[PDB]
Design a protein around this ligand. Structure first.
Ligand SMILES: [O-][n+]1ccc2c(-c3ccc(F)cc3F)cc(C3CCNCC3)nc2c1-c1c(Cl)cccc1Cl
Length: 342
């Protein structure tokens, strides 16, 4: 087998790709391109210094393994992964190819009170993708509009899992406005429902057209949050397994859950109901992706025979220490073993 690769310097970096891919244009390192073999326009990603270190060697493996496992209409998939190397001895580049989408929610919603029919179609897709993700016991951890690719047909694909800092999460920034508090403030080892909280921020935003919890810092955000959803009761308190977090919450002057119908004025009661059930402090009691696809709000889009689960994902590599070379070989095995879809 083996196709023929060709060079082109593209904004500071050399990309060497199979002939099939043509008309590469910059974007971010990512490129738009056109895949002659299949007729699909696609996004292409080159991992910078994929095996620079142990943290990085593991990271590339984690990413490639994740992209390799994901097969679903609402989750970022791999049409192709390749290296121009001819052996492990000079293997040093990974190019990850996916469908081209073209924008994300930010570049389409953005201070923009959408129609109820839209907001349903967007969240249904998130949740369908999330039912599939959560079914392989994978968590995303960092859901937010920028990690949701939308094409001009309102078709959503979930992107960029939380594979990996303190400065990138500080002050008035969207890097932190969608995070469940239990993880913003490291309260406990956290379930997968952390994602459902993020969907609830996103949803509120799409209807209201304004950031739900746009806190100026971690503690201002917690304050904005508790105000909307109540301060925690003694039951949740026991679960927060971090004496300093508990103590601080205990300091907070108690207050009750606000009425959402009055926060989301003129919003469809079904949506308000859903939000009520997503934005819950006790991660244990939130609605799941599965259960939410069965909610009335998505009755026009719910199809329990077209809401696939996944195969199981063996992530036991995570709790496993290895050398650069051993991660890179595990990575190489993954690249050369790849099979494309129909
Ligand atoms: O459609 N599309 C498809 C895939 C991506 C990817 C992307 C993710 C995994 C992969 F193996 C290959 C990729 F190209 C990474 C980014 C990165 C772009 C900058 N921000 C982080 C993700 N953007 C896109 C996009 C995209 C988006 Cl979501 C908005 C605008 C333009 C593009 Cl081409």
């Amino acid at each position: 087998e083996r196709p023929t690769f060709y060079r082109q310097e593209l904004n500071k970096t050399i990309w060497e790709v199979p002939e099939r891919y043509q008309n590469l244009s910059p974007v971010g390192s990512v490129c738009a391109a056109f895949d002659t073999k299949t007729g699909l326009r696609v996004a292409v990603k080159k991992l910078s210094r994929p095996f620079q270190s142990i943290i990085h060697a593991k990271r590339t493996y984690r990413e490639l393994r994740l992209l390799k496992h994901m097969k679903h209409e609402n989750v970022i998939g791999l049409l192709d992964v390749f290296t121009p190397a001819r052996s492990l001895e000079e293997f040093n580049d990974v190019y990850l190819v996916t469908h081209l989408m073209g924008a994300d929610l930010n570049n389409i919603v953005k201070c923009q009170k959408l129609t109820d029919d839209h907001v349903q179609f967007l969240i249904y897709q998130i949740l369908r993708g999330l039912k599939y993700i959560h079914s392989a016991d994978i968590i995303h951890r960092d859901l937010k509009p920028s990690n949701l690719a939308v094409n001009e047909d309102c078709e959503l694909k979930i992107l960029d899992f939380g594979l990996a800092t303190d400065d990138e999460m500080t002050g008035y920034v969207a890097t932190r406005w969608y995070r469940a508090p239990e993880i913003m403030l490291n309260w406990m080892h956290y379930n997968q429902t952390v994602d459902i909280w993020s969907v609830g921020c996103i949803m509120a935003e799409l209807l209201t057209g304004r950031t739900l919890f746009p806190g100026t810092d971690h503690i201002d955000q917690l304050k904005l949050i508790l105000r909307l959803v109540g301060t925690p009761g003694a039951e949740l308190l026991k679960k927060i397994s971090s004496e300093s977090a508990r103590n601080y919450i205990q300091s907070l002057t108690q207050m009750p859950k606000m009425n959402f119908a009055n926060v989301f004025i003129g919003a469809n009661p079904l949506a308000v109901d859903l939000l009520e059930k997503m934005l819950v402090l006790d991660s244990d009691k939130r609605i799941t992706a599965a259960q939410a696809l069965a909610h009335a709000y998505f009755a026009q889009y719910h199809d329990p025979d077209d809401e696939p689960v996944a195969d199981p994902y063996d992530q036991s590599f995570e709790s496993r220490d290895l050398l650069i070379d051993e991660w890179k070989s595990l990575t190489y095995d993954e690249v050369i073993s790849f099979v494309p879809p129909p």
